[PDB]
Swiss-Prot record, chain A:
Residue numbers of the full-length protein present here: 24 to 147 of 166
Tissue expression summary: Released primarily from activated T lymphocytes.
Residues where Pyrrolidone carboxylic acid is found: Q3
Species of provenance: Homo sapiens (Human)
Designated name of the protein: Interferon gamma
UniProt key word Signal: yes
Single GO MF descriptor: cytokine activity
Highest taxon of the lineage: Eukaryota
Swiss-Prot record, chains B, F:
Quaternary structure, from the entry: Heterodimer with IFNGR1, to form the IFNG receptor complex. Interacts (via intracellular domain) with JAK2.
Function comment: Associates with IFNGR1 to form a receptor for the cytokine interferon gamma (IFNG). Ligand binding stimulates activation of the JAK/STAT signaling pathway. Required for signal transduction in contrast to other receptor subunit responsible for ligand binding.
Organism encoding this protein: Homo sapiens (Human)
Recorded name of the encoding gene: IFNGR2
Presence of keyword Repeat: yes
Family: Belongs to the type II cytokine receptor family.
Residues represented out of the complete protein: 28 to 240 of 337
Designated name of the protein: Interferon gamma receptor 2
Curated annotation (Swiss-Prot), chain C:
Glycosylation sites: N7, N52, N59, N144
Disorder named in the UniProt entry: Immunodeficiency 27A: A form of Mendelian susceptibility to mycobacterial disease, a rare condition caused by impairment of interferon-gamma mediated immunity. It is characterized by predisposition to illness caused by moderately virulent mycobacterial species, such as Bacillus Calmette-Guerin (BCG) vaccine, environmental non-tuberculous mycobacteria, and by the more virulent Mycobacterium tuberculosis. Immunodeficiency 27B: A form of Mendelian susceptibility to mycobacterial disease, a rare condition caused by impairment of interferon-gamma mediated immunity. It is characterized by predisposition to illness caused by moderately virulent mycobacterial species, such as Bacillus Calmette-Guerin (BCG) vaccine, environmental non-tuberculous mycobacteria, and by the more virulent Mycobacterium tuberculosis.
Protein name as catalogued: Interferon gamma receptor 1
Paired cysteines (S-S): C50-C58, C95-C132, C160-C165, C179-C200
Organism in which the protein naturally occurs: Homo sapiens (Human)
Reported effect, C58Y: In IMD27A; interferon-gamma-mediated signaling pathway completely abrogated
Length: 126, 213, 203, 125, 207, 213
């Protein structure tokens, strides 16, 4: 009946990737096991960010499979709603950080430069 | 080649309805009826054809000058949280017109909320009990809910507003017994993300007399 | 070669899933073994549930981890000393594919209102912090000819506890017939529990 | 004198990478500009997580430069202290998520499977 | 070819940095141009600070964005209509390389204690970018009673001890003759640069 | 080849000191002195040689049976937040012994805190004023700090403990005037990450007499 739009589309991708086969149960879990260890939202957002960034990269690889484009882009928007709270700036800043190439010589020089002020505010505000 | 684009499109966001309408496109030399194609896209996404698989209704190469996304079934249509952008064009075979792109909308943010439905009032001793239906059924109450206001006043008196209250039933306590009171019910859609509220339309006036004892 | 079983299905009520299957009649009486494989356990392999059993069912309530975690069931047949190929079932999520009992409703009068108690279904009996629980209660209250749907969220500490949920509806002295039925909606898949037995009261 | 251990080691890497030249100022900022947009810790940790994963990735490529190994792993420990609150489990869970290959066919099937229950708890309680 | 300047240095006090350089004496009077380039500005380009100036200094307080953001300074010389190559300086962080004034100390007696007021240096109080990394995190307050000194630490984040105008420390005292001399210094947030030590203020217990 | 490993190593974590010691290794046929090598590692790190470049003290190829990390200069040694693991071995040219690996330590977590230094007590009207120095100087007070406890009692009386208090000066108000009181000062190191505490050692007992009025 009434269920969040991702459920319908997520199980559609489940069939396309054969994620319903009994062989997926092998070799533990990627995200579900870790996420149960961290109940504090600060810890969760640290882990969820890496998980959300993972799905966006995965969907980017299958942007050419037009069979699943409907299911993919619906889940992407629901992630934009649940995780980024529909904040377009939050979504756009997130995408910039991901796309930085760690082999771009200019990027690492700027990264090494900004390191001090990044470490300066890694700890929570007083 | 090139055709004239559809004229003056409108997005009707009333209650749970989602209807896109436009003025038809005609030619002087018209051989067959012109069809239209509607497409939707999310904030940073690809354009999709509005077809039975994508949205559950057939809105491409259709003869009608409107398309109702919410007609098929409950919860069908675009999710009320999503940021949806629509565009439209008229085409006659190989010929097609320019894309008429609508402004972006989020359902909770742009909806025109109607009055509460099926209002029933029963008198009590110096009070009036009001039971009513919600303006529309929301899937997730945690993300959005309704706040109701009752505008009550004695006949020929100054306005008084009781509210807001979450429940669909309220008691108008502390009223003058055996006196006529008139009331109006008005809802308010609250979306926690928006931190701005949508003021719903008021219902018709209806006056009732309280009991004696 | 011993034939493989057919039509493997899983039916769960109150998170107690049972595996069913069909087998052809044969001169000998065949025995079966039922194996379960859960998602979300380290080094997951097929766990034996029922061993060399002669009937066509197997209760796997003990093999239910998270009611929102998928699980698979396969069954093979043994006749004499020769066994058959496995008959694997579709993935089964107790929260999605299963069904939950109705909540218990209690009604009582007060001076200016009616207190409706919505007791959680018998599943959530203390006697594990899973995704599968109730998020909203659809409480249908019919007063005379018309019924209006209410929504009570479990997250509201002021309206629900772990043992009960309450809703207060104002009433008047005139003749009125209030009939109340309530159902629960699950968090992830929106699966609706069975509708409660409609309890009424009159003024 | 008294300063967090990263400062001494971070500016040593600046000299090694020539991050002190005036040409580094070009092309805006990577991290500093974004980090000033988000003051709420929930929003910060979302961004900082991607930044911390970036530095760990960068350090992993230069694990063979013995000139900077002391400075590199000293900064790593200070990150283990400041960002992970010296929680080894937090550090190890973070390291696991990063090492997941998005092209491993087995990994994406499991990711598509767990997607439903991940989305279920993306929003705050 | 006109020679390029030499020995470019930057000295900052109270976040007011001055650029200095040396140049050889010549028959004509040469003029210089000083250009600043900050880190953290989109499409960063060199900003002119002093243009065709004849002396060997240039106050660039207006070109200070974030006191914790690096900035670079280069200067060239012009004689007649011919110019020289630029003389670039090392990177300069106002918070790291600069120096901050001392705090102002006030002392006053009460019935059972002494209330020491530590007013922040005049840089941070005014009516020069705000919301910066660069501020004081702890105050090292040294209290010498007769011969002996004990170090105190007052954290800026403590709302009960510090506000935007001052920081306070309460020390209990007795009736016997005592000489309390107090000096205080501030420590910067990231680089730990210590401000100048305050002028020692004393007080005596005559009763 | 192979040598006997150093015997009974110990890590002294007292106040701000960080000293690794061990029993010497001897041979029957010994022509020249045996040296030792100390190495340190972080939680998920590489082993580093303890040399003047790495840690500021030379603890590689050393004849001594100890290695003092905090002796060189103020702020020297391992950061008190860090998870540090040390290992040790004896070597004689090509021959060396097995690695003796110490248990991991975090200084705030494993330190044995000493008593407050330079305690001075001055009597007051029905009171005693206590000023003392901190057991050691902490770089970041927000990460770790001291809580002080004063164990005071009248001569022939029962113990009373005032505390805890953050300041290095305290007033023992409400005391019997012109009476002798004996006191002890004891510190308590609190690390907010661990939310577990290090109980410091108490100072010597010292008795003082309060003022007249
Ligand atoms: C400060 O830093 C130290 C050093 O890194 C940490 O101590 C280590 O902590 C890790 C856990 O993060 C330990 O790793 C464990 O090792 C086990 C095997 O090692 C044992 O046996 C060898 C001898 O061969 C010795 O090293 C030692 O006696 C060990 O006891 C593994 O079996 C463990 O894995 C198991 O558990 C995990 C988690 O449940 C599962 O995922 C695995 O599948 C497996 O079941 C584990 O990897 C390591 O042994 C510790 N070293 C020491 C010397 O103690 C401190 O924890 C750290 N302190 C803080 C506060 O951060
Ligand atoms: C919803 O998505 C639309 C489509 O991107 C956003 O509208 C446009 O956004 C771009 C980029 O931010 C702007 O350049 C346009 O000016 C926007 N259009 C209009 C008419 O303003 C819209 O901002 C999104 N909504 C939210 C709340 O983020
Ligand atoms: C599980 O991992 C092993 C290697 O670690 C691999 O051989 C195996 O194929 C994996 N399981 C599945 C179902 O792919
Ligand atoms: C959509 O409706 C139109 C009616 O004008 C019809 O011609 C067209 O074939 C329909 N499309 C599909 C896919 O059925
Ligand atoms: C919805 O409202 C927003 C803000 O008022 C506006 O920017 C947007 O254009 C509106 N959308 C439509 C379709 O009117
Ligand atoms: C309210 O008044 C309108 C007239 O504008 C009418 O159409 C509508 O039916 C009335 N509502 C009810 C419940 O009668
Ligand atoms: C198995 O199920 C199918 C479809 O439901 C049905 O046609 C068939 O008769 C079943 N087989 C048996 C043995 O009941
Ligand atoms: C299955 O077995 C469990 C105990 O192992 C029992 O509690 C449960 O009721 C059984 N299921 C049914 C349907 O009886
Ligand atoms: C800045 O980026 C441009 C391309 O976007 C590049 O050509 C240029 O070299 C970069 N700046 C520096 C200092 O490398
Ligand atoms: C310039 O600096 C160098 C090195 O610091 C010094 O030897 C030289 O004397 C300086 N020249 C002048 C003119 O100050
Ligand atoms: C530098 O200039 C600023 C603003 O122009 C001024 O406030 C400051 O006093 C000047 N400093 C010096 C040393 O001249
Ligand atoms: C370290 O000290 C020992 C003293 O036994 C000495 O032999 C050795 O040369 C020293 N190492 C260095 C690098 O100075
Ligand atoms: C330090 O303390 C921890 C527990 O707090 C303990 O596991 C460890 O062995 C201790 N290390 C030393 C060197 O005492
Ligand atoms: C405390 O007593 C010990 C004797 O055990 C002595 O060595 C030490 O100096 C005394 N401390 C003071 C401050 O007098």
């Amino acid at each position: 009946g009434s269920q969040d739009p991702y459920v319908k589309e997520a199980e559609n991708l489940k069939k396309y990737f054969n994620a319903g086969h009994s062989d997926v149960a092998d070799n533990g879990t990627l995200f579900l096991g870790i996420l149960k260890n961290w109940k504090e939202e600060s810890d969760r957002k640290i882990m969820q960010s890496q998980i959300v960034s993972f799905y966006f990269k995965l969907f980017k690889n299958f942007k050419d499979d037009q069979s699943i484009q409907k299911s993919v882009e619906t889940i992407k928007e629901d992630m934009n709603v649940k995780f980024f709270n529909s904040n377009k700036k939050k979504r756009d800043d997130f995408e910039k950080l991901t796309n930085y190439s760690v082999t771009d010589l200019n990027v690492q020089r700027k990264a090494i430069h900004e390191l001090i002020q990044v470490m300066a505010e890694l700890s929570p505000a007083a | 080649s090139q055709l004239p684009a559809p004229q003056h499109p409108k997005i009707r966001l009333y209650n749970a309805e989602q209807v896109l309408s436009w003025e038809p496109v005609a030619l002087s030399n018209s051989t067959r009826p012109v069809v239209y194609q509607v497409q939707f896209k999310y904030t940073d996404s690809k354009w999709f054809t509005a077809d039975i698989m994508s949205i559950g209704v057939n809105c491409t190469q259709i003869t009608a000058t409107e398309c109702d996304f919410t007609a098929a079934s409950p919860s069908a249509g675009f999710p009320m949280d999503f940021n949806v952008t629509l565009r439209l064009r008229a085409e006659l075979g190989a010929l097609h017109s320019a894309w008429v792109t609508m402004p972006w909308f989020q359902h909770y943010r742009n909806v025109t909320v109607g009055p509460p439905e099926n209002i029933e009032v029963t008198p009590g001793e110096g009070s009036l009990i009001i039971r009513f239906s919600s303006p529309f059924d929301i899937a997730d109450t945690s993300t959005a809910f309704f706040c109701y206001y009752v505008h009550y006043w004695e006949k020929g008196g100054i306005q008084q507003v009781k509210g807001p209250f979450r429940s669909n039933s309220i008691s108008l306590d502390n009223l003058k017994p055996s006196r006529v009171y008139c009331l109006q019910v008005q809802a308010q859609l609250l979306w926690n993300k928006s931190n701005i509220f949508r003021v719903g339309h008021l219902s018709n006036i209806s006056c009732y007399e309280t009991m004696a004892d | 070669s011993v034939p493989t079983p057919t039509n493997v299905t899983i039916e769960s009520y109150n998170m107690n899933p049972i595996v069913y299957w069909e087998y052809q009649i044969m001169p000998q009486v065949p025995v079966f073994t039922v194996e379960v494989k859960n998602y979300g356990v380290k080094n997951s392999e097929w766990i034996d549930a029922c061993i060399n059993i002669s009937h066509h069912y197997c209760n796997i309530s003990d093999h239910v981890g998270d009611p929102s975690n998928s699980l698979w069931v396969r069954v093979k047949a043994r006749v004499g000393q020769k066994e058959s190929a496995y008959a694997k079932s579709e993935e089964f999520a107790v929260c999605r594919d299963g069904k939950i009992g109705p909540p218990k409703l209690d009604i009582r009068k007060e001076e200016k209102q009616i207190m409706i108690d919505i007791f959680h279904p018998s599943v959530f009996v203390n006697g594990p912090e899973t995704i599968c629980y109730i998020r909203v209660y659809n409480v249908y209250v019919r007063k005379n000819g018309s019924e209006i749907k209410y929504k009570i969220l479990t997250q509201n500490e002021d309206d629900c506890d772990e043992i009960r949920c309450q809703l207060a509806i104002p009433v008047s002295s005139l003749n009125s017939q209030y009939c109340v039925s309530a159902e629960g909606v699950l968090n992830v898949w929106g699966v609706t529990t069975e509708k409660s037995k409609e309890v009424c009261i009159t003024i």
